[PDB]
């Protein structure tokens, strides 16, 4: 009953992100004055079951110049560790529940870095190399960052559990004591994502495709489901860490709608916001976040660890 | 056998020519009519048709342009970089066949010189409307293949 | 209510096709179910709206 | 074991994918269609000489920094102490010598990328 | 018969618009920064 | 007939993108400022020069 | 074919080597299960390959050449090998660790068998076996690429043309002169 | 054109204009495209006398260059320096 | 952009190279009703500016 | 005239002053610009539904060529050969001798379609109205050699596609 639990978590993971690709097509659409896939399935339903189809029947290709070995790693540690990164979510229930699950997710995240460092590396080739370095150069930008935001929240929540977040947050959401920690963690998690503006790492058009321009067919395809699982599990984290939905214990899929509906509508935002603005430079994105977030988080940090103990609101361990 | 070989066809098919992904490669003139077909008015993206920078990442060559001697090893490098199956679409008179530069002594006369093609399609330039006639077209040659069934009866 | 006004033109749009099996025809034979005006038939068979 | 039967299950999914990707479809596999891509043209050099990082100076202070996250992630747990006046007294402390460690390097130009 | 030929209307084109407008909206930096440390203080709270 | 429609030439300060932007999109608006006045005193007559 | 339209070109081609051959690239491909199994270890076996460009040059010029009709064409290349000279050469070419060792000819066809069970093109085959372990014959009665205006190309030019692709990104750029040739039966 | 009141009122919030009035989709304020046939003028030259060809050929007036030095008092300007624009009273800053 | 195309495809029958300006004047004369669509065109365009 | 397009300095007010820090640390500008992008959201889209819906044409449109006849049914190409010579392309080639009956006309009329530019030079230059460009732009083939006309594909259009090409040629030779 624990494997059936596994594939009930991550064969519809696979099948939102598939329908991510659809909505994110048609969202961007409709701003663009267009339509978007309307004609493969009613309402361009069956789009995302063709591209699938289509990538999986495409010749993949080994690049001459490449480590065999470590380019065809890369894009399992990808996929591998975007569904390990649902585990812990608590949904109301987690499916492996974590006394550390925020500090889990922090480790998970670092490790999937090296599915882009290694892919760009191992694909020997000059475009790949530089998006892999961008790489590099992001995840300095906000990870240090991103760790001291979640711990300002964590000190209102006073665990490292996940789901002690939605006890924390059972008499009003994190992001009215929280709402300047709240746009910082909304950035950090743009720029971690490699998502617009700082889709870097890609960045069509200063790079072709960046990181993975040499990969095709199947081993491109994981590296875009691993994206776009991303996207949604980051947003579902965002709508867990400020946005707590009631859990009644005896009605639980009243939380999983609720709940739902905040994710889609934070992974609608991301689309929205890809729309919307230029790319940043990715020396301006290093800057961002070390000369105005950093400052402003450290800052936050120590008020954050005062006004607990001077309002007396220190919360339980438990 | 027959008929599962003949409903794979149909399924691989209807597949690669619903998910069609054209090289980001224009050349000259012509390259400004196929913006018009991504732009709102025709929307490309509509019928599953998306611009994928990489030849990697790629289904369709557009040869929207003069196509000179000076380019023409870069053309056939980035199709050869393609994995299959892969289409040529030819589009308008200097892809096609040199066209008011036909007689240039920098100018290739068509790029079926240097690639295969599947579908030409006339103007200079072909209007977008002309263009997305000669993508769907190229769907419909896509629609014919019988990849399964030849090898069935191999 | 408009919105109740916006859902009573999708179910006119079901019948002036000619009931549930012809909304389905053209909407996947044209991937649209806008109703107009038959302005006139070709020998062919074409119908033109 | 559930962990590691999660764990599991998600590498072996991803590389059965890898699996089917690869012996799936018919592959034509010739020189030039694997040679490495640049734009059209043939690259020039090779792709494994130095690459000059700029930012080197703040990813070394990165390492510095995010040691920093491992010092002060264990405050939600040190606020259940009895001897309060002592804690916040030093979690204070750090963070104010990481902000001035900031404030030097930023103030010495160390956030700037060489040219 | 007279002349017929593309030609503006006899009174002539309205008026086309063409300068900049980008309409000023939102309200004063001091409500929107009263508004969020008040959103802060009733969280604390 | 240039020297007959009025419009304003965009002019810049620092010489970088950012201006030549700006300096283009205000182009667009003196464009449709001379298309403005092209409208309006179109005269009759004929289009090509009566000299074949 | 001879009875039947008496006055056909009749041409018998060694084992061609190419880009795209059957031959050369078998050989390397053999990399991927470790050891080159070879029944008597190569010893046994002596091959003639012929270029694929002289074997289309003189299908072409018996097309043109009025006096190749009713006549029989034996295209064989210009140097002989034993076996394991031409296998050990073609992994020193593509500069992949060479690992022979000898197979029984029983036990090799039980392994083309095994094969053959794939419903594409099979990898090997048991008539494939056969094949590659048949000494060439030599045949000094009938006319050559010589005689059709063509001259034979040695194995040595054209075997970077074919085996690079074979060599990993270390190996890529080593030159035609790294690896020298092998021996020949004189 | 046919969206509903709310959804007018919703973008137009959104966006901070009157979207209506000028919207970028065309109605039926375009014109038909079926027009009455057109009856166009005749130039200067349609005349009945007075025409002579050689009283109005452009390219037979046209001359060879005028040699001013060949090698077979104040000082000048290839012409009067240009004036100083003035601001525009229209929008002198955007 | 698309509209303008049409305008330049009304003259002179192509979207792009319309081969319409020549030396001694134009091709053809501007088609009846054009002036007042290019009006229409214009009276919008400055909004898009706006947007943009 | 002239005007500056960046040469603002801006007011030093605490009121101003403040009100760019709320615009620096709130986004507000960055939200405005997220409210136009959901304006066009809530906007019909400009896409119509090719090829069921097409874009609009006039009479005066450069399609595929056609050899037209007079209402007897004689071609009324007399081979003078005028669009031979303007062509810019030189995607004319002509050849001509006495008919049967004497009268002049061409056993060779051929345009190479990958060489024309669809300039239309060819039609204006034509005394007869024999060489027209049609309404027709939907002619994409699959090989090259497809796109080679002969007079025999040429008078086939002109007979596949009369019915349309008189009625434009009736909306628009007054402007010629
Ligand atoms: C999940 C699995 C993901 C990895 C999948 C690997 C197999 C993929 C197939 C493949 O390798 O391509 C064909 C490739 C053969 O093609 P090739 O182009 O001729 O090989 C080129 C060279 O062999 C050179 O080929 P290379 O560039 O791949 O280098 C060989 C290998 C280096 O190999 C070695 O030198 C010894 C083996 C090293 C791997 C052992 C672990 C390394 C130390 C970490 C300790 C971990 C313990 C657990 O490189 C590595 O460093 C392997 C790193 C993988 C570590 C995975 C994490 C554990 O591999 C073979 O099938 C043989
Ligand atoms: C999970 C979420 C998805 C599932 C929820 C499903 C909720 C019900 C959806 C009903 C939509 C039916 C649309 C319709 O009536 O078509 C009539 C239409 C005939 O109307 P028409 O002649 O074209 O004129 C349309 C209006 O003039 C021009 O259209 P319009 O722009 O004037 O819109 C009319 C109407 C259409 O809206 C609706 O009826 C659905 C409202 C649900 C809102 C959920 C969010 O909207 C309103 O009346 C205003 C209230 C709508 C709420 C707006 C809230 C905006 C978000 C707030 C801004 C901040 C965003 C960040 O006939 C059709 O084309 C049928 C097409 C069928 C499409 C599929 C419909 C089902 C949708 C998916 C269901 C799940 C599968
Ligand atoms: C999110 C995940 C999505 C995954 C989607 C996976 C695709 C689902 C749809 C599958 C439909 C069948 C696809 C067949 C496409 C084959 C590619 C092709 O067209 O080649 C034409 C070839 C025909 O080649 P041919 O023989 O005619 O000639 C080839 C030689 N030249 C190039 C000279 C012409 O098809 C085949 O060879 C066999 C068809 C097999 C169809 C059934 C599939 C079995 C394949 C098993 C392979 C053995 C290894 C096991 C791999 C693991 C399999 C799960
Ligand atoms: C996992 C399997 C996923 C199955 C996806 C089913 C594909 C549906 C489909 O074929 O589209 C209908 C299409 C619809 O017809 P169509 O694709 O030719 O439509 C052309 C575009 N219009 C209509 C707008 C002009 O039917 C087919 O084309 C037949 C293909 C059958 C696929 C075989 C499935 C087995
Ligand atoms: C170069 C190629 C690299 C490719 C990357 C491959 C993927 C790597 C995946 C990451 C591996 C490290 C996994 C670390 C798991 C940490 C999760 C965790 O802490 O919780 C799991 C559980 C302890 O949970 P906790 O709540 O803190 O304490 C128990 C209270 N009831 O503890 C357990 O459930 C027991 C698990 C013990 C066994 C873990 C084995 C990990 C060893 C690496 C594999
Ligand atoms: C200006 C644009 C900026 C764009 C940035 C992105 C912002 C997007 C924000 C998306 C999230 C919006 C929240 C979605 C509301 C859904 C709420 C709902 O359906 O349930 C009702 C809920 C109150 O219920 P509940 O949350 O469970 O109680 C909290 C106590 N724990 O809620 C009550 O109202
Ligand atoms: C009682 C005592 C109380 C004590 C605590 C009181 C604290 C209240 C005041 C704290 C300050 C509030 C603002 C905190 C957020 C961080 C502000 C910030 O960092 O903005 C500056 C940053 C850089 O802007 P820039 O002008 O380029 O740099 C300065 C020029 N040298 O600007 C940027 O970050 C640019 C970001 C570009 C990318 C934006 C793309 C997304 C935009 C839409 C998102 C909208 C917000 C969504 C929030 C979601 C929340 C779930
Ligand atoms: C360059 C080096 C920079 C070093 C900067 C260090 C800054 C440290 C500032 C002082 C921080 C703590 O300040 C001190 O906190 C404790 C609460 O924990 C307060 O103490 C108060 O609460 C505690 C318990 O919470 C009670 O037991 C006590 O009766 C009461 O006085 C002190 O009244 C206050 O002075
Ligand atoms: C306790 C946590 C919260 C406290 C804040 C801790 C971080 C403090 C960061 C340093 C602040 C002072 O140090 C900083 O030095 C540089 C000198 O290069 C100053 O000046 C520089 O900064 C800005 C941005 O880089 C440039 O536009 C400017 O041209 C340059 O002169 C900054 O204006 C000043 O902010
Ligand atoms: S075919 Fe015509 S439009 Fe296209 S590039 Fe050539 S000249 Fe330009
Ligand atoms: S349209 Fe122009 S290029 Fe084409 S045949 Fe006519 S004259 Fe020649
Ligand atoms: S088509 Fe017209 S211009 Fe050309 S040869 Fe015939 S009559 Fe002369």
Known sequence: MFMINILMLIIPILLAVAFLTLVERKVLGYMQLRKGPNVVGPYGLLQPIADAIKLFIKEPLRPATSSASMFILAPIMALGLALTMWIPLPMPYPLINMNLGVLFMLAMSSLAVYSILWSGWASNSKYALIGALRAVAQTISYEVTLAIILLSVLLMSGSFTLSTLITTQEQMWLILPAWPLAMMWFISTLAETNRAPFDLTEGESELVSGFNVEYAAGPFALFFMAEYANIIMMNIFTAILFLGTSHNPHMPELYTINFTIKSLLLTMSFLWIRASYPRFRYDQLMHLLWKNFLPLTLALCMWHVSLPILTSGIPPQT | GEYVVAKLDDLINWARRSSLWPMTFGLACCAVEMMHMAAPRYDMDRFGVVFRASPRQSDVMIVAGTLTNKMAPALRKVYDQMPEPRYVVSMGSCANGGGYYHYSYSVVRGCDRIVPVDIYVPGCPPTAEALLYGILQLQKKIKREKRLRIWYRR | MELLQVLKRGLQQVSGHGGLRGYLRVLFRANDVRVGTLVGEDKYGNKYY | MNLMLALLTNFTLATLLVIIAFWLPQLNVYSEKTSPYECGFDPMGSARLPFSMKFFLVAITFLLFDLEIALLLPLPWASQTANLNTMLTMALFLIILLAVSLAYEWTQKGLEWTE | ?45 | VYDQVEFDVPIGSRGDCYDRYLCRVEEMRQSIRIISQCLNKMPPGEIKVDDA | VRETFPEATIIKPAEIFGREDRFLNYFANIRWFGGVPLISLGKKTVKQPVYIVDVTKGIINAIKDPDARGKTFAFVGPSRYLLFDLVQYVFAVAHRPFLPYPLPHFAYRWIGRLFEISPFEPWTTRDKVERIHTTDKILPHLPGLEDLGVEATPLELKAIEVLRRHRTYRWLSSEIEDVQPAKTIP | ASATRFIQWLRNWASGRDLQAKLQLRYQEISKRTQPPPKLPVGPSHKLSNNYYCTRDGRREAMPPSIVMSSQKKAVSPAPPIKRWELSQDEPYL | REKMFEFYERVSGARMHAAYVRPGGVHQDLPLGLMDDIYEFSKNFSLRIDEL | TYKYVNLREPSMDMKSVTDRAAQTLLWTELIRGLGMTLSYLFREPATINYPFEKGPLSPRFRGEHALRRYPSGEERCIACKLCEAVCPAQAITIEAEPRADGSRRTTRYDIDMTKCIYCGFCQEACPVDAIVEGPNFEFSTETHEELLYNKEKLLNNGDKWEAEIAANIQADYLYR
């Not at chain 5, 017929?4 to 930096?29: A, C």
């Open chain 5, 1 to 45: 018969s007279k002349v017929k030929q593309d030609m503006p209307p006899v009174g002539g084109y309205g008026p086309i618009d063409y300068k900049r407008n980008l309409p000023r909206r939102g309200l004063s930096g001091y409500s929107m920064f009263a508004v969020g440390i008040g959103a802060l203080l009733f969280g604390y709270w």
